Design a protein around this ligand. Structure first.
Ligand SMILES: [Mg+2]
Ligand SMILES: [Mg+2]
Ligand SMILES: [Mg+2]
Ligand SMILES: [Mg+2]
Ligand SMILES: [Mg+2]
Ligand SMILES: [Mg+2]
Ligand SMILES: [Mg+2]
Ligand SMILES: [Mg+2]
Ligand SMILES: [Mg+2]
Ligand SMILES: [Mg+2]
Ligand SMILES: [Mg+2]
Ligand SMILES: [Mg+2]
Ligand SMILES: [Mg+2]
Ligand SMILES: [Mg+2]
Ligand SMILES: [Mg+2]
Ligand SMILES: [Mg+2]
Ligand SMILES: [Mg+2]
Ligand SMILES: [Mg+2]
Ligand SMILES: [Mg+2]
Ligand SMILES: [Mg+2]
Ligand SMILES: [Mg+2]
Ligand SMILES: [Mg+2]
Ligand SMILES: [Mg+2]
Ligand SMILES: [Mg+2]
Ligand SMILES: [Mg+2]
Ligand SMILES: [Mg+2]
Ligand SMILES: [Mg+2]
Ligand SMILES: [Mg+2]
Ligand SMILES: [Mg+2]
Ligand SMILES: [Mg+2]
Ligand SMILES: [Mg+2]
Ligand SMILES: [Mg+2]
Ligand SMILES: [Mg+2]
Ligand SMILES: [Mg+2]
Ligand SMILES: [Mg+2]
Ligand SMILES: [Mg+2]
Ligand SMILES: [Mg+2]
Ligand SMILES: [Mg+2]
Ligand SMILES: [Mg+2]
Ligand SMILES: [Mg+2]
Ligand SMILES: [Mg+2]
Ligand SMILES: [Mg+2]
Ligand SMILES: [Mg+2]
Ligand SMILES: [Mg+2]
Ligand SMILES: [Mg+2]
Ligand SMILES: [Mg+2]
Ligand SMILES: [Mg+2]
Ligand SMILES: [Mg+2]
Ligand SMILES: [Mg+2]
Ligand SMILES: [Mg+2]
Ligand SMILES: [Mg+2]
Ligand SMILES: [Mg+2]
Ligand SMILES: [Zn+2]
Lengths: 157, 225, 138, 208
RNA sequence: GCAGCCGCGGUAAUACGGAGGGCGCGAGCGUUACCCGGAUUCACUGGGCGUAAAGGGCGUGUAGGCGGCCUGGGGCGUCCCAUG
RNA sequence: GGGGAGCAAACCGGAUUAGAUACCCGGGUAGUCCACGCCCUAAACGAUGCGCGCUAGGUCUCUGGGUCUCCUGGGGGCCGAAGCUAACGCGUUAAGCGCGCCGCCUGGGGAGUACGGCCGCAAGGCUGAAACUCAAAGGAAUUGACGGGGGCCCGCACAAGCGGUGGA
């Protein structure tokens, strides 16, 4: 029970003697606007069917974004193939200043203020993935402190 | 019922594979190599068999089902009989999907439950004698492949596999579904993929025979009798 | 030939960790051992110990990792996710105090060489001094 | 100039009620009450999904149209609001709300925002004892916003203050009904204004 | 005839032309020209070179660039304070 | 300047072919060979600059040393961890992780052209544009189609027959 978004829809061709033969691809985001978002890419031979598919997939591929007051805990830059996303967190009332794709993903995550640039290939699908991977990677003076102290944590805390 | 370092030697549990096939990751479980073959540190095997059996036990004590897996010709009849005495097992072929595509596989279960239904029935003597045989054949194959899977009414709480590098399909599936993997692992294997390991000969009857029984022994110990 | 031995140190640690080595040795140096001393405090490594390889001074760096993970790849989170040399020979990088940077919104380290010691960004900004910007970590 | 032209219609393009009109915007006549679809030949036909631009655009327009105001005056305030220490999303509305044309309407002297601009421009308004007739004049806190001693007798002036019999005025304001004066106390915090706007979308529309 | 670009128009044109209707701004709105942006497309920040454009045909070696471990002096670079 | 067996640009003659003016055949000069002096280009290719450190292993091979089951150096190959890559692939012979230094690239055609300069006996080489024009030029991979590509299979498809059409 999340909101869904359409990143993008495309049509694609095979070949058989006597014609092209088509298939559809849907890129779908799914969020609960409070720190959980999932991305799904589904292909079927019919467009709405593909989206259904896509939506199913999205919910299985879910990522808990640690939102820190409308924004993300530190800056971060992530490459995926040719494509590369940068996420710089921002102050209140800044807005999601991000491209076409990352926005949709960020918005449904529950993010409200954040800085962004795409870089390298701009391909939707990889930018989609680079963003989801970027968010999959964020940590906290908390998340981090446990990793480093860790090996005797709870002596100082 | 525990196990002696001695009994393990007699099994020939420590006899690894040749040096040719070999996973360097596995080195942490090796004493040395004599005449080409790595010899598994039993002093280790034993201390892992403990951590591992301790898991198997509480899991059983809490009602968990353990799926046993062995495709290898050596294992088969050992996996089978050992499982039965009370879990499910796979010993013919690991059908890709059995875990991650569990639904459409177990679909095939209701098919044979329903063909079993049809052969105890009058309604069978109806169909033309050609579909009749061709339906007994459908049933027959299903029993072959599924006679142990058909006990799983939901995904296992853990799977116990004999030879992870042979089975790393089964293994991959388990890890993707966050089901704990337990394996009898030789030197050819990535031990990192095995949540609960037992390093020792994955090859000889006398080896598997020992391990699997003591496992199962432990299971019905901690199932009340 | 060898030209940056601090690069070499960092990179030794980087490559080590990616293979989950428990530890790696690095040819010793008053300086390097200072940088290690820092990395120790901040919890990126369990610590270093001074050892001797063939009667050659070395520094055994003992690496630290995340906990095992479930899912189909269980190789622990890194603790030193990213280590990187900033001032290099053939382009040195000096920073005034009001130009010492922040690494990962405070979550990371910048190691600085100053006339008052080898300091972390925070340590240095507290003593009110700057210097050579060696590396960044997180 | 400012926008004159048919209004219950933007009421309809924005698909929500803007209260651009006045006494009937409240009655069973706003055509939102009768034809909630947008104007034109095609407003009957099912919509296409909006582009991000579309939604960013329209949310801007909805907000702007509510307040009267040219885009050049509008953008110039959003600009000023970004140069402010504050949360510009909010700072903006506070700035908007600071307009005399608006202060007057919120005060309840004018039936509507449009009617308010005239009341200002035709000189019917006192600010701190003096006359003001720029609808754009910015009211600061501590300002007293009165009706001219002259224009005290208008039908609508009196007819509107008699609706104040049973309304109560915004929390950042104080009305002196009998004395025909109102005072501007502080800037409205975001929570006071209850517009149907997602201010953040406006901000986003401008960072393109 | 349109056309910034991809393209549109060969008898059903949401792309030409007119009309109705709509959108955007409003004493202004468009066009052309020029600068910066977008263009991490000269990449200091911030790019590359097996096959996409890109390793000199190979060596020798000049200027230059760069350079191991410990201790101490100098304090040029570098860093801090005060002041102009 | 010497040398010339065999071969063989051009050239001579035979064939082929719609025409050969090439591919096939018979000849044959330069040249191919030696010395000396020039030329200085190449798919001069690993299409991968040099040096150094770091990052699983397996196997084949050339070549050193040892307490030579095996251990330990230096080469040459194949397969592969981690990683890298647009992919193909690379993967301790890196195209991985890093530092130093050099050379080079910046859309296709125009064009390795023009102009200028340098070298050269010459042929020519090195260095190297723009106007203009296009909206692509490109790399790898996917499905298909096709091949005077390969593999296996089938149809009265050929073959083996019997009887006809084409003539009246
Ligand atoms: Mg988290
Ligand atoms: Mg890249
Ligand atoms: Mg902040
Ligand atoms: Mg690009
Ligand atoms: Mg583009
Ligand atoms: Mg095996
Ligand atoms: Mg300075
Ligand atoms: Mg801008
Ligand atoms: Mg036109
Ligand atoms: Mg048009
Ligand atoms: Mg038209
Ligand atoms: Mg009209
Ligand atoms: Mg009009
Ligand atoms: Mg630029
Ligand atoms: Mg650079
Ligand atoms: Mg480039
Ligand atoms: Mg080429
Ligand atoms: Mg090339
Ligand atoms: Mg070369
Ligand atoms: Mg070249
Ligand atoms: Mg020199
Ligand atoms: Mg020097
Ligand atoms: Mg030095
Ligand atoms: Mg010194
Ligand atoms: Mg000194
Ligand atoms: Mg001094
Ligand atoms: Mg000095
Ligand atoms: Mg200085
Ligand atoms: Mg001669
Ligand atoms: Mg001839
Ligand atoms: Mg001839
Ligand atoms: Mg001849
Ligand atoms: Mg040596
Ligand atoms: Mg050897
Ligand atoms: Mg070798
Ligand atoms: Mg290979
Ligand atoms: Mg790999
Ligand atoms: Mg090497
Ligand atoms: Mg490269
Ligand atoms: Mg150029
Ligand atoms: Mg050009
Ligand atoms: Mg050239
Ligand atoms: Mg040439
Ligand atoms: Mg050339
Ligand atoms: Mg010339
Ligand atoms: Mg000459
Ligand atoms: Mg040359
Ligand atoms: Mg190709
Ligand atoms: Mg064929
Ligand atoms: Mg025939
Ligand atoms: Mg015949
Ligand atoms: Mg006839
Ligand atoms: Zn209305």
């Amino acid at each position: 029970d999340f909101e869904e978004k359409m990143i993008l829809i495309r049509r694609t061709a095979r070949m058989q003697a006597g014609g092209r033969r088509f298939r559809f691809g849907a890129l779908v985001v799914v969020g609960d606007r409070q720190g959980r978002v999932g991305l799904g890419f589904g292909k079927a031979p019919e467009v709405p069917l593909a989206v259904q598919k896509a939506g199913y997939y999205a919910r299985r591929n879910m990522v808990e974004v640690p939102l820190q007051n409308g924004t993300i805990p530190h800056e971060i830059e992530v490459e995926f193939g040719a494509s590369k996303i940068v996420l710089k967190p921002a102050a209140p009332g800044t807005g999601v200043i991000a491209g076409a794709v990352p926005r949709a993903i960020l918005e449904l995550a529950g993010v409200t203020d954040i800085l962004t640039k795409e870089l390298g290939s701009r391909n939707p699908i990889n930018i989609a993935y680079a963003t989801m991977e970027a968010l999959r990677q964020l940590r906290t003076k908390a998340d981090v402190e446990r990793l480093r102290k860790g090996e005797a944590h709870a002596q100082a805390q | 019922v525990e196990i002696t370092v001695k009994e393990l030697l007699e099994a020939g549990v420590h006899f690894g594979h040749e040096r040719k096939r070999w996973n360097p990751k596995f080195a942490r479980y090796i004493y040395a190599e004599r005449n080409g073959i790595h010899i598994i540190d039993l002093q280790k095997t034993m201390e892992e068999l403990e951590r591992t059996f301790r898991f198997i036990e509480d899991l059983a004590m809490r009602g968990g089902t353990i799926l046993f897996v062995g495709t290898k010709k050596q294992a088969q009849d050992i996996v089978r009989m050992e499982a039965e005495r009370g879990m499910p097992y796979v010993n013919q072929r690991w059908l890709g999907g059995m875990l991650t595509n569990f639904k459409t596989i177990s679909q095939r279960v209701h098919r044979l439950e329903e063909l079993e239904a049809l052969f105890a029935s009058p309604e069978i003597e109806e169909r033309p004698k050609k579909e009749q045989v061709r339906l007994k054949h459908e049933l027959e194959r299903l029993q072959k492949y599924l006679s142990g899977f058909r006990l799983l009414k939901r995904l296992p709480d853990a799977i116990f596999v004999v030879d992870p590098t042979k089975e790393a399909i089964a293994v991959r599936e388990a890890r993707k579904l966050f089901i704990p993997v337990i394996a009898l692992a030789d030197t050819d294997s990535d031990p990192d993929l095995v949540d609960y390991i037992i390093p020792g000969n994955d090859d000889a009857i006398r080896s598997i025979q020992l391990i699997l029984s003591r496992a199962v022994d432990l299971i019905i110990q901690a199932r009340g009798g | 030939m060898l030209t940056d031995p601090i690069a070499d140190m960092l990179t030794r640690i980087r490559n080590a960790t990616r293979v989950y080595k428990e530890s790696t040795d690095v040819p010793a140096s008053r300086f390097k051992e200072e940088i290690l001393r820092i990395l120790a405090r901040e919890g990126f490594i369990k610590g270093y110990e001074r050892v001797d390889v063939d009667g050659k001074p070395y520094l055994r760096v003992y690496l630290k990792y995340g906990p095992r993970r479930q899912g189909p790849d269980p190789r622990p989170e890194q603790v030193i996710h990213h280590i990187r040399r900033i001032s290099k020979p053939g382009r040195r990088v000096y920073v005034g105090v009001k130009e010492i940077p922040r690494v990962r919104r405070g979550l990371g380290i910048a190691i600085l060489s100053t006339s008052k010691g080898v300091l972390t960004d925070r340590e240095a900004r507290k003593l009110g001094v700057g210097g050579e910007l060696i590396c960044e970590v997180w | 100039g400012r926008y004159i032209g048919p209004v219950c219609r933007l009421c309809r393009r924005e698909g929500v009620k803007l209260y651009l009109k006045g006494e009937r915007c409240y009655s069973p006549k706003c055509a939102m009450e009768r034809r909630p679809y947008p104007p034109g030949q095609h407003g009957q036909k099912r919509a296409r999904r909006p582009s991000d631009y579309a939604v960013r655009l329209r949310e801007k327009q909805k907000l702007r149209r509510i307040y009267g105001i040219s885009e050049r005056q509008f953008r110039n305030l959003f600009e000023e609001a970004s140069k402010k220490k504050g949360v510009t999303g909010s700072v903006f509305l506070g700035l908007l709300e600071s307009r005399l044309d608006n202060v007057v309407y919120r005060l309840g002297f004018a039936v509507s925002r449009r009617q308010a601009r005239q009341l200002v421009r035709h000189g019917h308004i006192t600010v701190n004892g003096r006359r003001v007739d720029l609808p754009s004049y910015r009211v600061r806190p501590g300002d007293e916003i009165a009706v001219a001693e002259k224009s005290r007798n208008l039908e609508l002036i009196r007819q509107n203050l008699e609706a104040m019999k049973g309304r109560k005025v915004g929390p950042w304001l104080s009305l002196d009904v009998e004395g025909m004066k109102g005072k501007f106390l502080r800037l409205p915090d975001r929570e006071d204004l209850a517009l149907p706007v997602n201010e953040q979308l406006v901000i986003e529309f401008y960072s393109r």
